[PDB]
Design a protein around this ligand. Structure first.
Ligand SMILES: Nc1ncnc2c1ncn2[C@@H]1O[C@H](COP(=O)(O)OP(=O)(O)OP(=O)(O)O)[C@@H](O)[C@H]1O
Ligand SMILES: Nc1ncnc2c1ncn2[C@@H]1O[C@H](COP(=O)(O)OP(=O)(O)OP(=O)(O)O)[C@@H](O)[C@H]1O
Ligand SMILES: O=C(NOC[C@@H](O)CO)c1cc(Br)c(F)c(F)c1Nc1ccc(I)cc1F
Ligand SMILES: O=C(NOC[C@@H](O)CO)c1cc(Br)c(F)c(F)c1Nc1ccc(I)cc1F
Ligand SMILES: [Mg+2]
Ligand SMILES: [Mg+2]
Lengths: 289, 289
């Protein structure tokens, strides 16, 4: 079915960030509950047709680790991307309510992210460009999926920040970056969710006793590229998980691990075997089922 | 009169940037045409009342170099700031249509910015925090006014970027900045409008013959703080204007000129005396009257 503006009704507000909000909505003709992202773009009528055309590849992006797609269209001033509604929300939201996320839970998350990035690269020959806690969605069925990836080249152009960067050192410095940049973003996201707050700058010795102002714009980005990367605090986290994020946060992208090597890492192998009721822990911390 | 959501009607769209759009609107009860900025903020009901309370000082901000204020209120999801509609639009828009802006015209602009910043500091003890071509509005009467300044401390907190920085070196590096940061922003804006494009990085010798890719995020901000500041190209611009922006773009904020010294600069003294029909040139380049 072709999605259309007048066939929708606003239920509630799922959230917002650095632009247009996304609503919980009701596609009246199907009765299906969906999430509707609106991206306002002050753009000519020619290239906005190209954006919808390039967004049709999301129909062919079928995967359990990828957020579902129903269709895209231009209403009046803003393009629309309609997707599977994930009742658990994004991982930045569940980190707020949970304080920290257990290492065991982040194991299952890492499996979902690696398999999602792997699907996009092999089947669709594209990178994510925006891996962070807010673009990793979860639901009550226990599913962990990825949204907001770069399928349309024209949309990447039309939207080219925020005071929290998950961008790799190489992407920050210039145009010499590609799929490895996503690995850095994943590693930094995992350190954030494990520790309870954004990892840069790193906590001093005295701050780590409590758990177990904000930086200026240039101050933050200078730390990422020049100062040594964020490690995970020893003792409370296992050696396998410590080495996993260490491999993900190697400044040099060619020296840094890729999806191939991380898939066969000791941390992922152990996490696959583990009996983890992710659906139960998710509903316990946010309160749903 | 108290402004209210249901007493409004959308005429058209004046523009957008890094957030909510601003509409040309009709306040039905008064019949007055206004500009209505909507700032969506995912914020608690307690502190949003504080933001409206702090925005009431805009009523007392009466000045010919400051954009008029009618009132502010919380509708449903987004706060509203209602202001004088400036039919000429912002200076970034008129720079696009004009290619370059004459030195003589930028003289009159500089007078408006200095007198607007001076009014805010002396009478209201506050700084702008966001001087750039988009926050300098003009109209058919020939008026040049300033909008989008920091009157509410709580609103500054709730909104704390874009790939074009007008932030001073000191503000980029840390918290050690104040009213002098506005001077840098003014200087960089004047170089942009004079030359036809964003001054960083500076044009090479061969690019300046034509007139008379984009940088990465860290690449841009590293140029601002470490590499020498942007000069104005000699020959086509006068020595007075060259020294004016040179004083505005001194990296060291204490060494850099303040509003006092710039008011008595040779460039401003000459620009005051000059017979410049700003209203005629404005309507000629954008097409209005
Ligand atoms: N399909 C979805 N299901 C449930 N919630 C969603 C969905 N898509 C987005 N959201 C929620 O809406 C919020 C806003 O998403 P959006 O992509 O607009 O910005 P963001 O990713 O949060 O931050 P940024 O603008 O910095 O990328 C997210 O934090 C998320 O919680
Ligand atoms: N009072 C006004 N009268 C006429 N036009 C206006 C008025 N206020 C804003 N605009 C127009 O709306 C546009 C958007 O303004 P807004 O302050 O939302 O973002 P911006 O200043 O353009 O960019 P940024 O988001 O980077 O600060 C401006 O470019 C300007 O042309
Ligand atoms: O929406 C995208 N990213 O989020 C950032 C914006 O909300 C600004 O805050 C997005 C970006 C790019 Br580049 C792109 F090519 C897209 F198709 C995007 N949207 C998108 C992509 C995949 C899915 I499944 C859902 C979606 F909404
Ligand atoms: O609107 C303000 N600045 O623009 C940036 C946003 O649109 C995001 O793109 C603004 C910022 C601060 Br801090 C503040 F304290 C304000 F009151 C703002 N608004 C504002 C201030 C003065 C006037 I006259 C009009 C206005 F809309
Ligand atoms: Mg997102
Ligand atoms: Mg503005």
């Amino acid at each position: 079915m072709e999605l259309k503006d007048d066939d929708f009704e606003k239920i509630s507000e799922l959230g917002a960030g650095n632009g247009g909000v996304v609503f919980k909505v009701s596609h009246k003709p199907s009765g299906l509950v969906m999430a509707r992202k609106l991206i306002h773009l002050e753009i000519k009528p020619a290239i906005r047709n190209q954006i919808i055309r390039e967004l049709q590849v999301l129909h062919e992006c079928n995967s359990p680790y990828i957020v579902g797609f129903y269709g895209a269209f231009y209403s009046d001033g803003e393009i629309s991307i309609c997707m599977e509604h994930m009742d658990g929300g994004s991982l930045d939201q569940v980190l707020k309510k949970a304080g920290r996320i257990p290492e065991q839970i982040l194991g299952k998350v890492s499996i979902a992210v690696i398999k999602g990035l792997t699907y996009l690269r092999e089947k669709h020959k594209i990178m994510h460009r925006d891996v962070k806690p807010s673009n990793i969605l979860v639901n009550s069925r226990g599913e962990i999926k990825l949204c907001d990836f770069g399928v349309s080249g024209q949309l990447i152009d039309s939207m080219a920040v925020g005071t929290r960067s998950y961008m790799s050192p190489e992407r920050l410095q210039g145009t010499h970056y590609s799929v490895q940049s996503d690995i850095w973003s994943m590693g930094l996201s995992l350190v954030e969710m494990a520790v309870g707050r954004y990892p840069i700058p790193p906590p001093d010795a005295k701050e780590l006793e409590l758990m177990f102002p904000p930086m200026a714009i240039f101050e933050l980005l200078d730390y990422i590229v020049n100062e040594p990367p964020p490690k995970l605090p020893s003792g409370v986290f296992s050696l396998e998980f410590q080495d996993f994020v260490n491999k993900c946060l190697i400044k040099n992208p060619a020296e840094r691990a890729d999806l191939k090597q991380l898939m066969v890492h000791a941390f992922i192998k152990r996490s696959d075997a583990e009996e983890v009721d992710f659906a139960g822990w998710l509903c316990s911390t946010i309160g749903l089922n």
